Design an enzyme around this catalytic site. Sequence first.
Site, mmCIF file in Angstrom:
data_model
loop_
_atom_site.group_PDB
_atom_site.id
_atom_site.type_symbol
_atom_site.label_atom_id
_atom_site.label_comp_id
_atom_site.label_asym_id
_atom_site.label_seq_id
_atom_site.Cartn_x
_atom_site.Cartn_y
_atom_site.Cartn_z
ATOM 1 N N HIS A 164 2.522 8.801 0.014
ATOM 2 C CA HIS A 164 1.483 8.552 -1.013
ATOM 3 C C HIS A 164 1.955 9.278 -2.275
ATOM 4 O O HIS A 164 2.572 10.379 -2.148
ATOM 5 C CB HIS A 164 0.097 8.928 -0.479
ATOM 6 C CG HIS A 164 -0.324 8.327 0.824
ATOM 7 N ND1 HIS A 164 -1.157 7.220 0.898
ATOM 8 C CD2 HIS A 164 -0.138 8.736 2.101
ATOM 9 C CE1 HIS A 164 -1.428 6.946 2.160
ATOM 10 N NE2 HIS A 164 -0.810 7.856 2.918
ATOM 11 N N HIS A 212 0.860 -1.215 0.000
ATOM 12 C CA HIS A 212 0.000 0.000 0.000
ATOM 13 C C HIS A 212 0.883 1.247 0.000
ATOM 14 O O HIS A 212 0.468 2.274 -0.554
ATOM 15 C CB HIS A 212 -0.969 -0.033 1.190
ATOM 16 C CG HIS A 212 -1.818 -1.269 1.226
ATOM 17 N ND1 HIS A 212 -2.628 -1.654 0.160
ATOM 18 C CD2 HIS A 212 -2.007 -2.207 2.193
ATOM 19 C CE1 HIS A 212 -3.269 -2.769 0.471
ATOM 20 N NE2 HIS A 212 -2.891 -3.137 1.709
ATOM 21 N N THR A 230 -6.596 7.534 6.466
ATOM 22 C CA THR A 230 -6.982 7.523 5.032
ATOM 23 C C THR A 230 -6.959 6.092 4.498
ATOM 24 O O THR A 230 -7.285 5.907 3.327
ATOM 25 C CB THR A 230 -6.086 8.422 4.191
ATOM 26 O OG1 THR A 230 -4.871 7.690 4.081
ATOM 27 C CG2 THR A 230 -5.916 9.803 4.789
ATOM 28 N N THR A 231 -6.644 5.122 5.346
ATOM 29 C CA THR A 231 -6.684 3.688 4.997
ATOM 30 C C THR A 231 -7.632 2.995 5.969
ATOM 31 O O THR A 231 -7.905 3.491 7.046
ATOM 32 C CB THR A 231 -5.284 3.046 5.056
ATOM 33 O OG1 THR A 231 -4.993 2.652 6.398
ATOM 34 C CG2 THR A 231 -4.179 3.947 4.553
ATOM 35 N N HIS A 242 3.457 11.233 5.323
ATOM 36 C CA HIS A 242 2.766 11.168 6.631
ATOM 37 C C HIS A 242 3.720 10.674 7.727
ATOM 38 O O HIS A 242 4.252 9.574 7.586
ATOM 39 C CB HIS A 242 1.553 10.249 6.494
ATOM 40 C CG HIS A 242 0.537 10.839 5.586
ATOM 41 N ND1 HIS A 242 -0.387 10.069 4.936
ATOM 42 C CD2 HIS A 242 0.342 12.125 5.197
ATOM 43 C CE1 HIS A 242 -1.139 10.870 4.184
ATOM 44 N NE2 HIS A 242 -0.717 12.133 4.337
ATOM 45 N N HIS A 284 5.312 7.132 6.079
ATOM 46 C CA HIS A 284 5.041 6.476 4.782
ATOM 47 C C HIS A 284 4.661 7.550 3.766
ATOM 48 O O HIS A 284 4.618 8.759 4.115
ATOM 49 C CB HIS A 284 3.986 5.386 4.959
ATOM 50 C CG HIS A 284 2.679 5.944 5.387
ATOM 51 N ND1 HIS A 284 2.266 5.905 6.689
ATOM 52 C CD2 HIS A 284 1.739 6.629 4.700
ATOM 53 C CE1 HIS A 284 1.108 6.534 6.780
ATOM 54 N NE2 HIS A 284 0.777 6.988 5.584
HETATM 55 C C1 LIG Z 1 -2.415 -2.360 8.065
HETATM 56 C C2 LIG Z 1 -1.494 -1.429 7.287
HETATM 57 C C3 LIG Z 1 -2.272 -0.368 6.471
HETATM 58 C C4 LIG Z 1 -1.429 0.781 5.846
HETATM 59 N N1 LIG Z 1 -1.784 2.055 6.462
HETATM 60 C C5 LIG Z 1 -1.036 2.735 7.338
HETATM 61 O O1 LIG Z 1 0.104 2.431 7.590
HETATM 62 C C6 LIG Z 1 -1.516 3.940 8.110
HETATM 63 C C7 LIG Z 1 -1.874 5.088 7.417
HETATM 64 C C8 LIG Z 1 -2.322 6.272 8.061
HETATM 65 S S1 LIG Z 1 -2.655 7.667 7.243
HETATM 66 N N2 LIG Z 1 -2.412 7.421 5.639
HETATM 67 O O2 LIG Z 1 -3.951 8.149 7.649
HETATM 68 O O3 LIG Z 1 -1.661 8.662 7.505
HETATM 69 C C9 LIG Z 1 -2.360 6.211 9.550
HETATM 70 CL CL1 LIG Z 1 -2.843 7.655 10.495
HETATM 71 C C10 LIG Z 1 -1.956 5.073 10.260
HETATM 72 C C11 LIG Z 1 -1.546 3.916 9.611
HETATM 73 S S2 LIG Z 1 -1.092 2.505 10.510
HETATM 74 C C12 LIG Z 1 -1.596 2.682 12.192
HETATM 75 C C13 LIG Z 1 -3.144 2.537 12.178
HETATM 76 C C14 LIG Z 1 -3.680 1.108 12.006
HETATM 77 C C15 LIG Z 1 -3.904 0.300 13.134
HETATM 78 C C16 LIG Z 1 -4.380 -0.989 12.983
HETATM 79 C C17 LIG Z 1 -4.626 -1.485 11.701
HETATM 80 C C18 LIG Z 1 -4.381 -0.699 10.571
HETATM 81 C C19 LIG Z 1 -3.917 0.611 10.724
HETATM 82 ZN ZN LIG Z 2 -0.844 8.145 4.861
#
Ligand SMILES: CCCCNC(=O)c1cc(S(N)(=O)=O)c(Cl)cc1SCCc1ccccc1
Ligand SMILES: [Zn+2]
EC number: 4.2.1.1
Lengths: 251, 251
Positions: free
Chosen positions: A88, A60, A192-193, A111, A86
């Site tokens: 985008h 992702h 956003t995921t 991010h 990470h």
């Molecule tokens: C299971 C991996 C999914 C990939 N997404 C992220 O790493 C991720 C992206 C964001 S974003 N694009 O809003 O900035 C955020 Cl704020 C956190 C995470 S990972 C930590 C949150 C999480 C916890 C449990 C399961 C999945 C995600």
């Molecule tokens: Zn992100």
Amino acid sequence: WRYGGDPPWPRVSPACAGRFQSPVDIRPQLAAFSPALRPLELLGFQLPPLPELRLRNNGHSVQLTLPPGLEMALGPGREYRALQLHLHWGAAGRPGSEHTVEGHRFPAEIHVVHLSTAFARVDEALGRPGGLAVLAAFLEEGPEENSAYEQLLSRLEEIAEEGSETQVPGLDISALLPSDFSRYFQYEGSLTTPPCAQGVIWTVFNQTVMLSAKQLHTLSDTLWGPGDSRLQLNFRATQPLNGRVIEASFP
Amino acid sequence: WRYGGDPPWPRVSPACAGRFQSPVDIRPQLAAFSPALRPLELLGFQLPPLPELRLRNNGHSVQLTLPPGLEMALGPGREYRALQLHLHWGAAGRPGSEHTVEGHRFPAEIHVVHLSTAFARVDEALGRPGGLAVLAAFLEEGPEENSAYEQLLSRLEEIAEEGSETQVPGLDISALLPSDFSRYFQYEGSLTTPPCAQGVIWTVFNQTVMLSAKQLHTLSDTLWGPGDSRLQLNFRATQPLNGRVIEASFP
Ligand SMILES: CCCCNC(=O)c1cc(S(N)(=O)=O)c(Cl)cc1SCCc1ccccc1
Ligand SMILES: [Zn+2]
Ligand SMILES: CCCCNC(=O)c1cc(S(N)(=O)=O)c(Cl)cc1SCCc1ccccc1
Ligand SMILES: [Zn+2]
């Protein structure tokens, strides 16, 4: 779940159907000047080379896992610890930032995800007010090569395969962000995921960060995602404010 | 623990020595106007006369227990349920408010204590940012009997002894608060009693509520506290902002 099709995010996590999702179109016109918003303070972002950090193609994005000891304050009494960063991005002259400004999508977005010091674990913080905080910066095409970004971008080759990882030396994590920590938009949104949990404080810098065309191309053209697919256009569609007001730290 | 006596609070609850405690001195001229602050929304506050509500002398205040169904919003998706309300007051000629404006202490103060809907239990919310929210209004002297307050002040008689409680008819809780819900101060702070847990969002109404000098007298002079001594001056000293900027919903 994946970008560009099924499984519909709501069937995965119901919270991906919440009223107050991210990312959003920032309209600086409609932002509220909020002089309570003091400059951001980062402690411990200047890491030594050892110990090494894991960099992962999770299918992702590319994710840099950060060590304990990175402390971040959005203000007095608003204390966070960095977990990971990470990116985008889009494809060849198709931009892929998640946030837009007056409808303009930038080439790519970083991010840095942070956990409120009041929580031991991320799963306790999901959906809780201010439980996570993201620091977000656009990356634009520039003339020079970003030497700070070159340390991560020179290693993408090794994690081309989805689900692959490598170890990389510690670096100045704060050198991946803009120098102006005083000028930003702030709003309450979501991941956003999936699972798209609400309660996330988004901070989005006014100042952008410049990468060379080779650098942007390296980010967009190097990694592979689910299926025989390139890992590209790894951004969610902009989400309506639905009556949220974005704050601005400057007039 | 006791009001006025001993022991130093930080010796019952080290949290009482936190950097981000309540109550505070509000200086309206040093407050930051944030246009993002919307009018407070209070639904379900107009209670029918039955069921009756527990009103209790708990030795530190008089406390009305609120039923389920009082929903409150500080902003979109930022919702709360009311738990209880209680008062702080002075004595015979001494004002007893907790918050102060440009040094001025008011005769009394009402606190309506709410739980964020992101937490099932108060104990999970304690110390978490936004976990608890208090609506606070200054009570001052005016010429008329206050009909809303009379429902409580007339029952203090029956619960004068520390530990005594009584049932009272349902009342309109929104009728104990000021007129204009668009006009308030807000800052993040603490319980003003032990255990002095931080993360409490304080909302203080600009406008006051008027009680007859008879009524204030009934409030300060009817109740018995810890020991064979009166329940009076049940407020905490002002606490330093320590870099915290108090926000205002109005220019
Ligand atoms: C299971 C991996 C999914 C990939 N997404 C992220 O790493 C991720 C992206 C964001 S974003 N694009 O809003 O900035 C955020 Cl704020 C956190 C995470 S990972 C930590 C949150 C999480 C916890 C449990 C399961 C999945 C995600
Ligand atoms: Zn992100
Ligand atoms: C044990 C002593 C009880 C007296 N204090 C309160 O009831 C109280 C007062 C406030 S204040 N003045 O900030 O508005 C608030 Cl915000 C909450 C409570 S009760 C709920 C929190 C709590 C839990 C467990 C023990 C004590 C307090
Ligand atoms: Zn109180």
